Structures are given as C-alpha cells and as structure tokens.
PDB file of all heavy atoms in Angstrom:
ATOM      1  N   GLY A  13      -4.427  23.553  58.928  1.00 38.25           N
ATOM      2  CA  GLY A  13      -4.527  24.361  57.699  1.00 38.25           C
ATOM      3  C   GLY A  13      -3.469  24.209  56.628  1.00 38.25           C
ATOM      4  O   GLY A  13      -3.307  25.090  55.794  1.00 38.25           O
ATOM      5  N   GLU A  14      -2.756  23.106  56.557  1.00 41.95           N
ATOM      6  CA  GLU A  14      -1.732  22.848  55.604  1.00 41.95           C
ATOM      7  C   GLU A  14      -2.219  22.390  54.246  1.00 41.95           C
ATOM      8  O   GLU A  14      -3.293  21.789  54.147  1.00 41.95           O
ATOM      9  CB  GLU A  14      -0.696  21.810  56.180  1.00 41.95           C
ATOM     10  CG  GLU A  14      -0.046  22.380  57.472  1.00 41.95           C
ATOM     11  CD  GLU A  14       0.813  21.475  58.381  1.00 41.95           C
ATOM     12  OE1 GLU A  14       0.727  20.280  58.175  1.00 41.95           O
ATOM     13  OE2 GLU A  14       1.490  22.004  59.245  1.00 41.95           O
ATOM     14  N   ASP A  15      -1.491  22.666  53.224  1.00 40.70           N
ATOM     15  CA  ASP A  15      -1.979  22.505  51.869  1.00 40.70           C
ATOM     16  C   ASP A  15      -1.963  21.042  51.522  1.00 40.70           C
ATOM     17  O   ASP A  15      -0.988  20.356  51.530  1.00 40.70           O
ATOM     18  CB  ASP A  15      -1.108  23.294  50.921  1.00 40.70           C
ATOM     19  CG  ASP A  15      -1.258  22.975  49.473  1.00 40.70           C
ATOM     20  OD1 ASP A  15      -2.335  22.495  49.083  1.00 40.70           O
ATOM     21  OD2 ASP A  15      -0.246  23.160  48.720  1.00 40.70           O
ATOM     22  N   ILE A  16      -3.148  20.546  51.113  1.00 43.50           N
ATOM     23  CA  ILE A  16      -3.392  19.148  50.757  1.00 43.50           C
ATOM     24  C   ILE A  16      -2.466  18.671  49.563  1.00 43.50           C
ATOM     25  O   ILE A  16      -2.184  17.452  49.450  1.00 43.50           O
ATOM     26  CB  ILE A  16      -4.890  18.824  50.600  1.00 43.50           C
ATOM     27  CG1 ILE A  16      -5.180  17.325  50.641  1.00 43.50           C
ATOM     28  CG2 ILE A  16      -5.362  19.501  49.347  1.00 43.50           C
ATOM     29  CD1 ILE A  16      -4.771  16.637  51.898  1.00 43.50           C
ATOM     30  N   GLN A  17      -2.158  19.658  48.670  1.00 42.16           N
ATOM     31  CA  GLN A  17      -1.311  19.254  47.595  1.00 42.16           C
ATOM     32  C   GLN A  17       0.007  18.806  48.042  1.00 42.16           C
ATOM     33  O   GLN A  17       0.688  18.042  47.305  1.00 42.16           O
ATOM     34  CB  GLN A  17      -1.084  20.586  46.659  1.00 42.16           C
ATOM     35  CG  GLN A  17      -2.353  21.142  46.090  1.00 42.16           C
ATOM     36  CD  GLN A  17      -3.218  20.191  45.338  1.00 42.16           C
ATOM     37  OE1 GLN A  17      -4.432  20.091  45.393  1.00 42.16           O
ATOM     38  NE2 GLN A  17      -2.538  19.373  44.489  1.00 42.16           N
ATOM     39  N   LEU A  18       0.407  19.048  49.269  1.00 40.88           N
ATOM     40  CA  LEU A  18       1.628  18.578  49.864  1.00 40.88           C
ATOM     41  C   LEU A  18       1.530  17.027  50.061  1.00 40.88           C
ATOM     42  O   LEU A  18       2.603  16.431  50.325  1.00 40.88           O
ATOM     43  CB  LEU A  18       2.075  19.335  51.090  1.00 40.88           C
ATOM     44  CG  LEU A  18       2.555  20.751  50.766  1.00 40.88           C
ATOM     45  CD1 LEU A  18       2.717  21.543  52.065  1.00 40.88           C
ATOM     46  CD2 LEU A  18       3.832  20.745  50.029  1.00 40.88           C
ATOM     47  N   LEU A  19       0.377  16.523  50.019  1.00 41.65           N
ATOM     48  CA  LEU A  19       0.234  15.078  50.249  1.00 41.65           C
ATOM     49  C   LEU A  19       0.990  14.239  49.157  1.00 41.65           C
ATOM     50  O   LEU A  19       1.607  13.201  49.459  1.00 41.65           O
ATOM     51  CB  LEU A  19      -1.185  14.657  50.258  1.00 41.65           C
ATOM     52  CG  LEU A  19      -1.526  13.230  50.634  1.00 41.65           C
ATOM     53  CD1 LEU A  19      -0.890  12.832  51.995  1.00 41.65           C
ATOM     54  CD2 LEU A  19      -3.072  12.998  50.713  1.00 41.65           C
ATOM     55  N   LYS A  20       0.977  14.728  47.917  1.00 38.82           N
ATOM     56  CA  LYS A  20       1.761  14.030  46.859  1.00 38.82           C
ATOM     57  C   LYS A  20       3.212  14.031  47.117  1.00 38.82           C
ATOM     58  O   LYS A  20       3.956  13.071  47.044  1.00 38.82           O
ATOM     59  CB  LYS A  20       1.403  14.590  45.499  1.00 38.82           C
ATOM     60  CG  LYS A  20       2.092  13.808  44.336  1.00 38.82           C
ATOM     61  CD  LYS A  20       1.609  14.168  43.008  1.00 38.82           C
ATOM     62  CE  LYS A  20       2.134  13.359  41.882  1.00 38.82           C
ATOM     63  NZ  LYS A  20       1.461  12.026  41.828  1.00 38.82           N
ATOM     64  N   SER A  21       3.730  15.235  47.550  1.00 37.82           N
ATOM     65  CA  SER A  21       5.190  15.364  47.905  1.00 37.82           C
ATOM     66  C   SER A  21       5.478  14.421  49.076  1.00 37.82           C
ATOM     67  O   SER A  21       6.555  13.739  49.046  1.00 37.82           O
ATOM     68  CB  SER A  21       5.502  16.763  48.334  1.00 37.82           C
ATOM     69  OG  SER A  21       5.236  17.632  47.325  1.00 37.82           O
ATOM     70  N   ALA A  22       4.593  14.243  50.022  1.00 37.08           N
ATOM     71  CA  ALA A  22       4.821  13.297  51.209  1.00 37.08           C
ATOM     72  C   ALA A  22       5.010  11.947  50.677  1.00 37.08           C
ATOM     73  O   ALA A  22       5.920  11.228  51.093  1.00 37.08           O
ATOM     74  CB  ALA A  22       3.681  13.520  52.239  1.00 37.08           C
ATOM     75  N   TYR A  23       4.062  11.497  49.843  1.00 33.38           N
ATOM     76  CA  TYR A  23       4.154  10.122  49.318  1.00 33.38           C
ATOM     77  C   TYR A  23       5.402   9.851  48.414  1.00 33.38           C
ATOM     78  O   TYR A  23       5.850   8.745  48.397  1.00 33.38           O
ATOM     79  CB  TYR A  23       2.888   9.765  48.525  1.00 33.38           C
ATOM     80  CG  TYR A  23       1.784   9.224  49.393  1.00 33.38           C
ATOM     81  CD1 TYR A  23       0.540   9.952  49.575  1.00 33.38           C
ATOM     82  CD2 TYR A  23       1.868   8.063  50.076  1.00 33.38           C
ATOM     83  CE1 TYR A  23      -0.548   9.433  50.311  1.00 33.38           C
ATOM     84  CE2 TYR A  23       0.882   7.553  50.826  1.00 33.38           C
ATOM     85  CZ  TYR A  23      -0.326   8.237  50.936  1.00 33.38           C
ATOM     86  OH  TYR A  23      -1.316   7.649  51.701  1.00 33.38           O
ATOM     87  N   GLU A  24       5.908  10.847  47.755  1.00 33.83           N
ATOM     88  CA  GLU A  24       7.103  10.721  46.968  1.00 33.83           C
ATOM     89  C   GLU A  24       8.265  10.213  47.774  1.00 33.83           C
ATOM     90  O   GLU A  24       9.147   9.426  47.206  1.00 33.83           O
ATOM     91  CB  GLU A  24       7.498  12.037  46.203  1.00 33.83           C
ATOM     92  CG  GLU A  24       6.523  12.320  45.152  1.00 33.83           C
ATOM     93  CD  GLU A  24       6.662  13.727  44.499  1.00 33.83           C
ATOM     94  OE1 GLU A  24       7.341  14.665  45.061  1.00 33.83           O
ATOM     95  OE2 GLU A  24       6.062  13.926  43.334  1.00 33.83           O
ATOM     96  N   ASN A  25       8.375  10.482  49.027  1.00 32.72           N
ATOM     97  CA  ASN A  25       9.443   9.956  49.889  1.00 32.72           C
ATOM     98  C   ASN A  25       9.438   8.403  49.913  1.00 32.72           C
ATOM     99  O   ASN A  25      10.417   7.739  50.049  1.00 32.72           O
ATOM    100  CB  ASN A  25       9.308  10.458  51.353  1.00 32.72           C
ATOM    101  CG  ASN A  25       9.442  11.891  51.429  1.00 32.72           C
ATOM    102  OD1 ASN A  25      10.519  12.365  51.305  1.00 32.72           O
ATOM    103  ND2 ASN A  25       8.391  12.693  51.664  1.00 32.72           N
ATOM    104  N   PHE A  26       8.223   7.784  49.678  1.00 30.37           N
ATOM    105  CA  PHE A  26       8.239   6.293  49.706  1.00 30.37           C
ATOM    106  C   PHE A  26       8.999   5.715  48.550  1.00 30.37           C
ATOM    107  O   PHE A  26       9.458   4.564  48.629  1.00 30.37           O
ATOM    108  CB  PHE A  26       6.759   5.780  49.540  1.00 30.37           C
ATOM    109  CG  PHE A  26       5.797   5.960  50.749  1.00 30.37           C
ATOM    110  CD1 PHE A  26       6.035   6.966  51.688  1.00 30.37           C
ATOM    111  CD2 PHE A  26       4.732   5.149  50.802  1.00 30.37           C
ATOM    112  CE1 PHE A  26       5.094   7.152  52.654  1.00 30.37           C
ATOM    113  CE2 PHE A  26       3.835   5.291  51.859  1.00 30.37           C
ATOM    114  CZ  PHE A  26       3.921   6.212  52.785  1.00 30.37           C
ATOM    115  N   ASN A  27       9.220   6.519  47.410  1.00 27.36           N
ATOM    116  CA  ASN A  27       9.853   5.930  46.220  1.00 27.36           C
ATOM    117  C   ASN A  27      11.307   5.688  46.470  1.00 27.36           C
ATOM    118  O   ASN A  27      11.973   5.107  45.609  1.00 27.36           O
ATOM    119  CB  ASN A  27       9.574   6.822  45.044  1.00 27.36           C
ATOM    120  CG  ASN A  27       8.159   6.706  44.600  1.00 27.36           C
ATOM    121  OD1 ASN A  27       7.580   5.607  44.604  1.00 27.36           O
ATOM    122  ND2 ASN A  27       7.562   7.810  44.244  1.00 27.36           N
ATOM    123  N   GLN A  28      11.911   6.180  47.581  1.00 28.86           N
ATOM    124  CA  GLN A  28      13.288   5.986  47.867  1.00 28.86           C
ATOM    125  C   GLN A  28      13.552   4.615  48.551  1.00 28.86           C
ATOM    126  O   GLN A  28      14.675   4.335  48.911  1.00 28.86           O
ATOM    127  CB  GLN A  28      13.868   7.125  48.714  1.00 28.86           C
ATOM    128  CG  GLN A  28      13.763   8.499  48.063  1.00 28.86           C
ATOM    129  CD  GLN A  28      14.688   8.560  46.819  1.00 28.86           C
ATOM    130  OE1 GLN A  28      15.842   8.113  46.788  1.00 28.86           O
ATOM    131  NE2 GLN A  28      14.152   9.145  45.757  1.00 28.86           N
ATOM    132  N   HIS A  29      12.395   3.793  48.718  1.00 25.84           N
ATOM    133  CA  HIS A  29      12.553   2.552  49.461  1.00 25.84           C
ATOM    134  C   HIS A  29      11.762   1.485  48.643  1.00 25.84           C
ATOM    135  O   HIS A  29      10.664   1.700  48.245  1.00 25.84           O
ATOM    136  CB  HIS A  29      11.963   2.664  50.842  1.00 25.84           C
ATOM    137  CG  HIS A  29      12.678   3.722  51.604  1.00 25.84           C
ATOM    138  ND1 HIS A  29      13.850   3.473  52.314  1.00 25.84           N
ATOM    139  CD2 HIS A  29      12.446   5.062  51.726  1.00 25.84           C
ATOM    140  CE1 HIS A  29      14.250   4.612  52.830  1.00 25.84           C
ATOM    141  NE2 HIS A  29      13.438   5.584  52.435  1.00 25.84           N
ATOM    142  N   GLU A  30      12.453   0.316  48.406  1.00 23.79           N
ATOM    143  CA  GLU A  30      11.891  -0.667  47.499  1.00 23.79           C
ATOM    144  C   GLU A  30      10.512  -1.278  48.087  1.00 23.79           C
ATOM    145  O   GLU A  30       9.640  -1.656  47.315  1.00 23.79           O
ATOM    146  CB  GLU A  30      12.894  -1.781  47.328  1.00 23.79           C
ATOM    147  CG  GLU A  30      14.036  -1.361  46.398  1.00 23.79           C
ATOM    148  CD  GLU A  30      14.908  -2.545  45.941  1.00 23.79           C
ATOM    149  OE1 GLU A  30      14.580  -3.683  46.351  1.00 23.79           O
ATOM    150  OE2 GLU A  30      15.923  -2.269  45.276  1.00 23.79           O
ATOM    151  N   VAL A  31      10.494  -1.486  49.451  1.00 25.05           N
ATOM    152  CA  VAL A  31       9.325  -2.055  50.052  1.00 25.05           C
ATOM    153  C   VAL A  31       9.142  -1.361  51.409  1.00 25.05           C
ATOM    154  O   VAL A  31      10.053  -1.078  52.175  1.00 25.05           O
ATOM    155  CB  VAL A  31       9.509  -3.539  50.364  1.00 25.05           C
ATOM    156  CG1 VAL A  31       8.325  -4.161  50.980  1.00 25.05           C
ATOM    157  CG2 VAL A  31       9.923  -4.313  49.090  1.00 25.05           C
ATOM    158  N   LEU A  32       7.826  -1.031  51.745  1.00 22.31           N
ATOM    159  CA  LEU A  32       7.530  -0.278  52.962  1.00 22.31           C
ATOM    160  C   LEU A  32       6.190  -0.875  53.540  1.00 22.31           C
ATOM    161  O   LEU A  32       5.297  -1.181  52.809  1.00 22.31           O
ATOM    162  CB  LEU A  32       7.273   1.147  52.700  1.00 22.31           C
ATOM    163  CG  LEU A  32       8.230   1.957  51.912  1.00 22.31           C
ATOM    164  CD1 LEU A  32       7.860   1.874  50.456  1.00 22.31           C
ATOM    165  CD2 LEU A  32       8.352   3.381  52.387  1.00 22.31           C
ATOM    166  N   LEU A  33       6.093  -0.875  54.842  1.00 21.38           N
ATOM    167  CA  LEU A  33       4.871  -0.964  55.596  1.00 21.38           C
ATOM    168  C   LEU A  33       4.434   0.414  56.033  1.00 21.38           C
ATOM    169  O   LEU A  33       5.300   1.176  56.632  1.00 21.38           O
ATOM    170  CB  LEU A  33       5.085  -1.813  56.836  1.00 21.38           C
ATOM    171  CG  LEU A  33       3.940  -1.883  57.898  1.00 21.38           C
ATOM    172  CD1 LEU A  33       2.715  -2.455  57.254  1.00 21.38           C
ATOM    173  CD2 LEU A  33       4.375  -2.692  59.092  1.00 21.38           C
ATOM    174  N   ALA A  34       3.227   0.785  55.683  1.00 20.77           N
ATOM    175  CA  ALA A  34       2.885   2.210  55.975  1.00 20.77           C
ATOM    176  C   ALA A  34       1.438   2.435  56.310  1.00 20.77           C
ATOM    177  O   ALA A  34       0.544   1.622  55.941  1.00 20.77           O
ATOM    178  CB  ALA A  34       3.215   3.032  54.774  1.00 20.77           C
ATOM    179  N   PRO A  35       1.175   3.509  56.956  1.00 19.87           N
ATOM    180  CA  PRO A  35      -0.210   4.055  57.134  1.00 19.87           C
ATOM    181  C   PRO A  35      -0.564   4.914  55.959  1.00 19.87           C
ATOM    182  O   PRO A  35       0.280   5.391  55.266  1.00 19.87           O
ATOM    183  CB  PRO A  35      -0.152   4.824  58.420  1.00 19.87           C
ATOM    184  CG  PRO A  35       1.223   5.466  58.319  1.00 19.87           C
ATOM    185  CD  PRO A  35       2.091   4.468  57.612  1.00 19.87           C
ATOM    186  N   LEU A  36      -1.864   5.212  55.885  1.00 20.51           N
ATOM    187  CA  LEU A  36      -2.309   6.273  54.927  1.00 20.51           C
ATOM    188  C   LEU A  36      -1.892   7.611  55.414  1.00 20.51           C
ATOM    189  O   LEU A  36      -2.344   8.030  56.502  1.00 20.51           O
ATOM    190  CB  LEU A  36      -3.778   6.175  54.710  1.00 20.51           C
ATOM    191  CG  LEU A  36      -4.241   5.019  53.787  1.00 20.51           C
ATOM    192  CD1 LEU A  36      -5.706   4.907  53.897  1.00 20.51           C
ATOM    193  CD2 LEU A  36      -3.776   5.211  52.373  1.00 20.51           C
ATOM    194  N   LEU A  37      -1.058   8.358  54.709  1.00 21.15           N
ATOM    195  CA  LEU A  37      -0.609   9.617  55.131  1.00 21.15           C
ATOM    196  C   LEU A  37      -1.746  10.647  55.175  1.00 21.15           C
ATOM    197  O   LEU A  37      -2.629  10.666  54.379  1.00 21.15           O
ATOM    198  CB  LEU A  37       0.489  10.127  54.148  1.00 21.15           C
ATOM    199  CG  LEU A  37       1.796   9.320  54.022  1.00 21.15           C
ATOM    200  CD1 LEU A  37       2.682   9.974  53.035  1.00 21.15           C
ATOM    201  CD2 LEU A  37       2.485   9.186  55.378  1.00 21.15           C
ATOM    202  N   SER A  38      -1.687  11.476  56.171  1.00 18.46           N
ATOM    203  CA  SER A  38      -2.554  12.534  56.529  1.00 18.46           C
ATOM    204  C   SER A  38      -3.917  12.059  56.831  1.00 18.46           C
ATOM    205  O   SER A  38      -4.854  12.913  57.142  1.00 18.46           O
ATOM    206  CB  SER A  38      -2.642  13.599  55.375  1.00 18.46           C
ATOM    207  OG  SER A  38      -1.482  14.318  55.204  1.00 18.46           O
ATOM    208  N   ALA A  39      -4.160  10.718  57.102  1.00 18.46           N
ATOM    209  CA  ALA A  39      -5.376  10.166  57.573  1.00 18.46           C
ATOM    210  C   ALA A  39      -5.445  10.297  59.073  1.00 18.46           C
ATOM    211  O   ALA A  39      -4.604  10.935  59.673  1.00 18.46           O
ATOM    212  CB  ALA A  39      -5.536   8.705  57.098  1.00 18.46           C
ATOM    213  N   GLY A  40      -6.462   9.738  59.710  1.00 16.44           N
ATOM    214  CA  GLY A  40      -6.636   9.818  61.155  1.00 16.44           C
ATOM    215  C   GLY A  40      -6.679  11.233  61.653  1.00 16.44           C
ATOM    216  O   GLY A  40      -7.312  12.090  61.082  1.00 16.44           O
ATOM    217  N   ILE A  41      -5.899  11.460  62.707  1.00 16.13           N
ATOM    218  CA  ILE A  41      -5.867  12.783  63.387  1.00 16.13           C
ATOM    219  C   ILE A  41      -5.344  13.875  62.535  1.00 16.13           C
ATOM    220  O   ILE A  41      -5.392  15.047  62.825  1.00 16.13           O
ATOM    221  CB  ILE A  41      -5.228  12.771  64.774  1.00 16.13           C
ATOM    222  CG1 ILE A  41      -3.719  12.450  64.681  1.00 16.13           C
ATOM    223  CG2 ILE A  41      -5.993  11.713  65.653  1.00 16.13           C
ATOM    224  CD1 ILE A  41      -2.995  12.496  66.068  1.00 16.13           C
ATOM    225  N   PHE A  42      -4.683  13.528  61.389  1.00 18.05           N
ATOM    226  CA  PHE A  42      -4.207  14.647  60.454  1.00 18.05           C
ATOM    227  C   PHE A  42      -5.334  15.127  59.625  1.00 18.05           C
ATOM    228  O   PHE A  42      -5.138  16.142  58.876  1.00 18.05           O
ATOM    229  CB  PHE A  42      -3.090  14.081  59.587  1.00 18.05           C
ATOM    230  CG  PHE A  42      -1.722  14.037  60.247  1.00 18.05           C
ATOM    231  CD1 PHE A  42      -1.472  13.239  61.364  1.00 18.05           C
ATOM    232  CD2 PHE A  42      -0.641  14.792  59.698  1.00 18.05           C
ATOM    233  CE1 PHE A  42      -0.260  13.219  61.927  1.00 18.05           C
ATOM    234  CE2 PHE A  42       0.606  14.763  60.301  1.00 18.05           C
ATOM    235  CZ  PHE A  42       0.776  13.914  61.453  1.00 18.05           C
ATOM    236  N   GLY A  43      -6.502  14.567  59.606  1.00 18.25           N
ATOM    237  CA  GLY A  43      -7.742  15.279  59.093  1.00 18.25           C
ATOM    238  C   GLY A  43      -8.008  15.229  57.649  1.00 18.25           C
ATOM    239  O   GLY A  43      -9.021  15.791  57.176  1.00 18.25           O
ATOM    240  N   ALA A  44      -7.230  14.528  56.821  1.00 22.83           N
ATOM    241  CA  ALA A  44      -7.525  14.356  55.483  1.00 22.83           C
ATOM    242  C   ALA A  44      -8.535  13.176  55.278  1.00 22.83           C
ATOM    243  O   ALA A  44      -8.768  12.352  56.046  1.00 22.83           O
ATOM    244  CB  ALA A  44      -6.295  14.193  54.637  1.00 22.83           C
ATOM    245  N   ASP A  45      -9.138  13.140  53.982  1.00 22.07           N
ATOM    246  CA  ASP A  45     -10.007  12.117  53.615  1.00 22.07           C
ATOM    247  C   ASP A  45      -9.182  10.897  53.267  1.00 22.07           C
ATOM    248  O   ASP A  45      -8.369  10.971  52.298  1.00 22.07           O
ATOM    249  CB  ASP A  45     -10.742  12.630  52.402  1.00 22.07           C
ATOM    250  CG  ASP A  45     -11.643  11.471  51.696  1.00 22.07           C
ATOM    251  OD1 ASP A  45     -11.781  10.372  52.336  1.00 22.07           O
ATOM    252  OD2 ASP A  45     -12.217  11.805  50.683  1.00 22.07           O
ATOM    253  N   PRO A  46      -9.296   9.795  53.984  1.00 20.77           N
ATOM    254  CA  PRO A  46      -8.454   8.605  53.639  1.00 20.77           C
ATOM    255  C   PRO A  46      -8.641   8.043  52.301  1.00 20.77           C
ATOM    256  O   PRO A  46      -7.686   7.429  51.730  1.00 20.77           O
ATOM    257  CB  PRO A  46      -8.833   7.568  54.815  1.00 20.77           C
ATOM    258  CG  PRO A  46     -10.104   8.082  55.259  1.00 20.77           C
ATOM    259  CD  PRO A  46     -10.162   9.496  55.140  1.00 20.77           C
ATOM    260  N   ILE A  47      -9.793   8.190  51.688  1.00 19.80           N
ATOM    261  CA  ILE A  47     -10.018   7.791  50.325  1.00 19.80           C
ATOM    262  C   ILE A  47      -9.174   8.587  49.327  1.00 19.80           C
ATOM    263  O   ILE A  47      -8.542   7.958  48.395  1.00 19.80           O
ATOM    264  CB  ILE A  47     -11.557   7.792  49.970  1.00 19.80           C
ATOM    265  CG1 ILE A  47     -12.431   6.920  50.803  1.00 19.80           C
ATOM    266  CG2 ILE A  47     -11.764   7.617  48.435  1.00 19.80           C
ATOM    267  CD1 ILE A  47     -13.870   6.983  50.496  1.00 19.80           C
ATOM    268  N   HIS A  48      -9.135   9.950  49.496  1.00 20.91           N
ATOM    269  CA  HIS A  48      -8.217  10.816  48.798  1.00 20.91           C
ATOM    270  C   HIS A  48      -6.823  10.378  48.961  1.00 20.91           C
ATOM    271  O   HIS A  48      -5.974  10.249  48.025  1.00 20.91           O
ATOM    272  CB  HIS A  48      -8.469  12.238  49.047  1.00 20.91           C
ATOM    273  CG  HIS A  48      -7.454  13.129  48.426  1.00 20.91           C
ATOM    274  ND1 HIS A  48      -7.359  13.293  47.025  1.00 20.91           N
ATOM    275  CD2 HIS A  48      -6.470  13.916  48.972  1.00 20.91           C
ATOM    276  CE1 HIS A  48      -6.442  14.154  46.813  1.00 20.91           C
ATOM    277  NE2 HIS A  48      -5.854  14.545  47.871  1.00 20.91           N
ATOM    278  N   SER A  49      -6.395  10.157  50.247  1.00 19.95           N
ATOM    279  CA  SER A  49      -5.015   9.668  50.599  1.00 19.95           C
ATOM    280  C   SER A  49      -4.672   8.401  49.805  1.00 19.95           C
ATOM    281  O   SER A  49      -3.568   8.279  49.274  1.00 19.95           O
ATOM    282  CB  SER A  49      -4.801   9.513  52.021  1.00 19.95           C
ATOM    283  OG  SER A  49      -3.436   9.175  52.290  1.00 19.95           O
ATOM    284  N   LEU A  50      -5.601   7.446  49.770  1.00 21.76           N
ATOM    285  CA  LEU A  50      -5.314   6.180  49.064  1.00 21.76           C
ATOM    286  C   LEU A  50      -5.125   6.433  47.504  1.00 21.76           C
ATOM    287  O   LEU A  50      -4.227   5.819  46.943  1.00 21.76           O
ATOM    288  CB  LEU A  50      -6.474   5.177  49.285  1.00 21.76           C
ATOM    289  CG  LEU A  50      -6.304   3.832  48.547  1.00 21.76           C
ATOM    290  CD1 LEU A  50      -5.014   3.154  48.833  1.00 21.76           C
ATOM    291  CD2 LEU A  50      -7.525   3.028  48.913  1.00 21.76           C
ATOM    292  N   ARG A  51      -5.953   7.357  46.915  1.00 21.26           N
ATOM    293  CA  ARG A  51      -5.798   7.692  45.548  1.00 21.26           C
ATOM    294  C   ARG A  51      -4.419   8.234  45.293  1.00 21.26           C
ATOM    295  O   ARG A  51      -3.745   7.913  44.293  1.00 21.26           O
ATOM    296  CB  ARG A  51      -6.907   8.626  45.167  1.00 21.26           C
ATOM    297  CG  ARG A  51      -7.044   8.864  43.706  1.00 21.26           C
ATOM    298  CD  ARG A  51      -7.667   7.747  43.011  1.00 21.26           C
ATOM    299  NE  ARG A  51      -6.649   7.066  42.294  1.00 21.26           N
ATOM    300  CZ  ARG A  51      -6.771   5.809  41.773  1.00 21.26           C
ATOM    301  NH1 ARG A  51      -7.812   5.099  41.997  1.00 21.26           N
ATOM    302  NH2 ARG A  51      -5.779   5.352  41.019  1.00 21.26           N
ATOM    303  N   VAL A  52      -3.975   9.265  46.137  1.00 19.05           N
ATOM    304  CA  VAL A  52      -2.691   9.914  45.894  1.00 19.05           C
ATOM    305  C   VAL A  52      -1.630   8.822  46.053  1.00 19.05           C
ATOM    306  O   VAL A  52      -0.676   8.785  45.297  1.00 19.05           O
ATOM    307  CB  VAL A  52      -2.498  11.125  46.871  1.00 19.05           C
ATOM    308  CG1 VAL A  52      -1.104  11.674  46.636  1.00 19.05           C
ATOM    309  CG2 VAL A  52      -3.584  12.147  46.636  1.00 19.05           C
ATOM    310  N   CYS A  53      -1.705   7.966  47.038  1.00 20.94           N
ATOM    311  CA  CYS A  53      -0.744   6.865  47.251  1.00 20.94           C
ATOM    312  C   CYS A  53      -0.612   6.034  45.890  1.00 20.94           C
ATOM    313  O   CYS A  53       0.483   5.883  45.413  1.00 20.94           O
ATOM    314  CB  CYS A  53      -1.197   6.011  48.371  1.00 20.94           C
ATOM    315  SG  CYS A  53       0.027   4.636  48.678  1.00 20.94           S
TER     316      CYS A  53
END
C-alpha cells in the first residue's frame, strides 16, 4: 500500500551515479506497472 508517487523519489537516487546497471524499480514482486516505472525512469 505504499504511495506510487514515491517512485520518482526512488529514481532520483540514480542521479548520484554517472552510470548504473539497474532493474525497473517497483516492478516484479513490488507490484507496480513496469511500463509506468519505465516512464518515471
């Protein structure tokens, strides 16, 4: 039941690193729509 608006805040952490290998945040067992996650990314 966590607020999906927090997905943007989660992705902001990536900006502290010049290059990253990553999964789509909140996808899979975290229950968000991976298409939305990609858009936020």
Side-chain angles (χ1 to χ4, degrees):
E14 296 168 349
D15 165 25
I16 195 60
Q17 299 306 135
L18 288 170
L19 186 54
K20 188 171 184 77
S21 302
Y23 274 117
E24 287 171 341
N25 295 286
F26 290 23
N27 289 321
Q28 300 293 318
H29 302 278
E30 287 189 6
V31 182
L32 315 86
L33 171 62
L36 284 170
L37 298 179
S38 296
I41 67 175
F42 280 63
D45 174 7
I47 297 180
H48 175 65
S49 182
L50 177 56
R51 187 78 252 165
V52 179
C53 181

